[PDB]
Design a protein around this ligand. Structure first.
Ligand SMILES: CSC[C@H]1O[C@H](O)[C@H](O)[C@@H]1O
Ligand SMILES: CSC[C@H]1O[C@H](O)[C@H](O)[C@@H]1O
Lengths: 315, 319
């Protein structure tokens, strides 16, 4: 029934990754036949707190907290839990055994993409690093970049740029055009969100510098694929998941808790290395095609209790 | 084309820091079977932990003007000048488990950063991010130090995963010495309920200490490396040994000889030759009735193609 109300509260909604996650979640809600309520704070942590309050006051069955920072949200999460509202997070670490945490295995992601850069350059590169602090997934990936710089000391960070603005791709493009003049020795880009990467790449192609750079990113969408497969694209590899299936999982997890199910504390969606060469060799032009060609992207597996699986069948 | 220098005349020296335990014995067996297959001559010297002995061994092989040296473990500061000298004399060098700042020297490893991440995360997740861990590892070894970094990151991501003791030394009787240490560590930290041991010789000691004390159900042990000995000890009833992450060391050893032989043939090799490591759970061994490495590789083919230039694989056909 639609008596079951699940609220999705997000910090960030810009870009195809977040849009597809959102579609994912709506698609899963529709299959269960539950009511999904959405709210998005666009970077404003005060507004995010008040949105979570609205859902506590409305006494929803569950809240999904998407991104955010622990420090402001933590007492709101405790309050919600104490009132019988189930809580699951995506991309937020919470110290409470009642709250399953969903993530894309960000430590692995930060390791796979940073090593890919390292090995491709036989351990010697001048890297423009595109990332920013204060986001769970970004901080996790960051740690592994630091370990790659330790293991491969010829892999040098010559710049760190980037900010999450709500026009991130467009603002990263501008930054990257200044960064290339400031750091003419740079020959690689490591961008820890596809919206960062998109700006970097566009800056590279406009400058006519596609031969001078290799770009390594996180995440994959049809837009990323389209940009990867362009002739002379400097965009070499990305690591990520189908965010569509991640948003479904988020809603399934929430529904499972409402049904009284006890979930694992950590729900790790397994990320995949996707190279330009793999896409080009396989004539992949969109995500349908990609998940067909790399089926490890399309995996069923997490959080399908029998009752819930049976329920989706019915509808 | 078959390179001119290729076959018994091709001499390859394997200089090792450490030789104790089945992992290392199996690597050596593998190297010998690969040398047998190429028809080349493999020379072996093992320093058993003495860096000064290690330097003299490398130097003996330089003087003998072998075609190539494999440097196995060791530390870069003591060894770097012997490596550079060798390179200048036209001796080809490849390493296993030693990081070298020179583009002429391929480095073989088991992707130790991934190993350290995979095993440490497996512990974290099995305990839902709360555990009191006895950490068994020591500094001064390339692979151990790489794995160590990933342990530190797991402690950061999962702050309920607590290090309550660090133990271990590499001694020549490491398993037996780690048993003794583990007996004392369990008494000093009775709250401890997991072990993370970054070499199977450390793990073996820890597990035997646990079983002797009768505490198999109060502990879960996570390690690196896999051998038939490890398998046998994992599949025992009530074993606390629940998972290890590793590679087939025999194939790592074959690889090291192949690489060496490739360089002598004039081939340019990748700078990094990472052997892909695998998660191997006690549960997976039991469900599939695995009792030895033969059976594990068969059951898990990813443990099963690096550095096979045409001439080299063709050469192994003729022999
Ligand atoms: C601004 S945080 C952006 C990242 O969050 C999600 O985890 C996506 O993977 C994206 O890379
Ligand atoms: C003493 S160093 C021991 C480690 O080196 C080898 O690489 C094996 O993986 C072992 O764990």
């Amino acid at each position: 029934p639609k008596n079951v109300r699940i609220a999705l509260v997000r910090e960030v909604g810009e870009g195809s990754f977040f849009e597809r996650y959102l579609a994912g979640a709506q698609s899963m809600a529709r299959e269960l036949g539950v009511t999904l309520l959405e709210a998005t704070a666009h970077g404003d942590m005060a507004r995010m707190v008040t949105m979570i309050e609205n859902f506590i006051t409305q006494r929803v069955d569950a809240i999904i907290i998407d991104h955010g920072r622990p420090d402001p949200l933590m007492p709101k999460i405790k309050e919600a839990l104490d009132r019988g509202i189930r809580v699951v997070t995506f991309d937020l670490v919470v110290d409470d055994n009642r709250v399953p945490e969903i993530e894309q295995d960000d430590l692995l992601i930060g390791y796979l993409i940073s090593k890919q850069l390292a090995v491709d350059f036989a351990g010697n590169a001048n890297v423009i690093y595109v990332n920013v602090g204060g986001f769970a997934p970004l901080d996790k990936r960051d740690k592994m970049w630091q370990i790659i710089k330790w293991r491969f000391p010829g892999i040098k960070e010559v710049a760190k740029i980037g900010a999450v603005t709500g026009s991130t791709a467009a603002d990263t493009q501008t930054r990257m055009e200044a960064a290339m003049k400031e750091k003419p020795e740079a020959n690689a880009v490591l961008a820890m969100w596809d919206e960062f990467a998109k700006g970097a790449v566009r800056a590279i192609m406009q400058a006519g510098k596609s031969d001078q750079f290799k770009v390594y990113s996180v995440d994959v969408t049809t837009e990323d694929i389209q940009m990867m497969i362009q002739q002379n694209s400097p965009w070499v590899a990305t690591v990520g998941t189908d965010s569509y299936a991640v948003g479904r999982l988020a809603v399934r997890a929430a529904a499972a808790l409402v049904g009284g199910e006890k979930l694992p504390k950590y729900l790790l969606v397994e990320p995949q290395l996707i190279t330009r060469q793999f896409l080009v060799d396989n004539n992949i032009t969109n995500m349908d095609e990609l998940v067909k060609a790399l089926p490890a992207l399309g995996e069923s597996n997490l959080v399908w209790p029998e009752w819930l699986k049976a329920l989706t069948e019915k509808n």
